[PDB]
From a paper:
The ER-localized Hsp70 chaperone BiP plays an important role in protein-folding homeostasis. Like Hsp70s in other compartments, BiP does so by the reversible binding and release of unfolded client proteins, a tightly regulated process that depends on the concentration of active BiP and on the nucleotide bound to it. MANF’s SAP domain engages BiP in the ADP-bound state and disfavors nucleotide exchange, thus acting as an NEI to modulate BiP’s activity. Our studies suggest that MANF contributes to protein-folding homeostasis in the ER by antagonizing nucleotide exchange on BiP, thus stabilizing certain BiP–client interactions.
Attempts to co-crystalize MANF in complex with BiP in a conformation consistent with client binding were unsuccessful. Nonetheless, the BiP component of the crystallization mix yielded informative crystals (at a resolution of 2.1 Å). Despite a truncation of the C-terminal α-helical lid (28–549) and the presence of a V461F mutation (known to inhibit client binding), in the crystal lattice, BiPV461F molecules were packed with the hydrophobic interdomain linker of one protomer engaged as a conventional client in the SBD of an adjacent protomer. A similar daisy-chain arrangement had previously been observed in the crystal structure of a bacterial Hsp70 in the ADP-bound conformation. Interestingly, superposition of the NBD–MANF complex onto the structure of BiP oligomers reveals a clash with the SBD domain of the adjacent protomer that engages the interdomain linker. These crystallographic findings fit with MANF’s observed preference for the ADP-bound state of BiP, but suggest that MANF would be excluded from the core of BiP oligomers.
Residue numbers in the entry: 29 to 67, 72 to 132, 135 to 527
Amino acid sequence: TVVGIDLGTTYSCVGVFKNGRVEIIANDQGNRITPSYVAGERLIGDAAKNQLTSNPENTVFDAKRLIGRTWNDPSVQQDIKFLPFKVVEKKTKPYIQVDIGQTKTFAPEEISAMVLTKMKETAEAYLGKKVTHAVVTVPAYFNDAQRQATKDAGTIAGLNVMRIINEPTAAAIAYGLDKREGEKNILVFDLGGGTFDVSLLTIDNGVFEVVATNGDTHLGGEDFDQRVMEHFIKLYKKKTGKDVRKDNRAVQKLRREVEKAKRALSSQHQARIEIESFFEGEDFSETLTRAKFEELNMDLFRSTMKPVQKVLEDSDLKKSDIDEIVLVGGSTRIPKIQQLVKEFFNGKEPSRGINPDEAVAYGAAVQAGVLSGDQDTGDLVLLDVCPLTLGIETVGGVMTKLIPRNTVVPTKKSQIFSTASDNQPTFTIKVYEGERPLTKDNHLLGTFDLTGIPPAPRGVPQIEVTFEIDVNGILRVTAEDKGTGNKNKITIT
């Protein structure tokens, strides 16, 4: 069976379509999203990320920033300034050098391969079978090199990447926006852990097109965490006099608490940050209000509107021209974000229902099912049918059908006719092809007579007219006096 994988900058997610529903699969730790992190032993996911504070030089993350790019790419030269691990050119490509005290050099797609191996190892456990096929998502702005590099990361991990799909397109498919009538302008607002992407999608009768894209490559949920961590470190110093910044474990534990507290503030107006051994055996427990969280981050929040205005004016659209707003990324749970977006679109409510950090993985899994042979319902048999309507002329030049259009061949169909006059001694069978009610508007294929009808009043004699089509398309029309056994036939080609 084939799975859907969201391979994100900061977190990755895996889903699958089974028993008429998509299932987002939790990992060994029970988390439905896995950090895109790799760190004597080799660690992948939550374990690797927990090591960052103590061993930054040899903890690899944000490989998606480098994948399928050249060393002299201004984006690469900019990003390597703030990455703690060693990035070196080799044949014009950026390579990551870490200490396993063995030193090793990894291509970005090799780090991504390890992350995909973990997501593959998450789905196999749940399903109880080996996973060999996947639909993998990429940002809409990815070029062929970045798409191929992502394909190669799947191949190294032992997956047949059937399709590579745009992240905004996958989000739209999760909300079933592909299964509506007419044309729709859709904005995708994607605020992830480390990246902000805005995408203007057009859908005209099932067909998706990415009109324009914008955002900020260095804005995400983790920037909101940093602002809160700053606040509580400053406050703890003021409350006590202990500076905590250089205590690896203190910052590690504070980050965990701020992440969970932030998520609670998406549901409630107050959350408690409780650390048990914060610094030198001292406990720390404080309340963070929603109001205080919003105050610390309001300028970051307001900055997400600027790229939204740019995609609109780059695509020659007004706010009014937008039909749907789809929210993607964990950070779009933040009530103030949803409030700002709604305010921006003069009272229009963004689309919600799917957990916004699972939306891309959900949509990937839907397309996965569409290419999955496991979802087999029932088989078809081709029918041989007659493309034309065949019949005979009745009193008044009326078209009486014996073989309707799309009747299956071979066939034998009989209808009973009688005389239109008292002691009528003969019938003329006039064979017609066409759809019109008067035979004058239809095509004559031929005629024959049936003579020697014994005398009787009108409507009393009983004649069976039979139309026979065999395999060759040979039409054979028979008229039989059922009373006597009198017969005549014609064969039309």
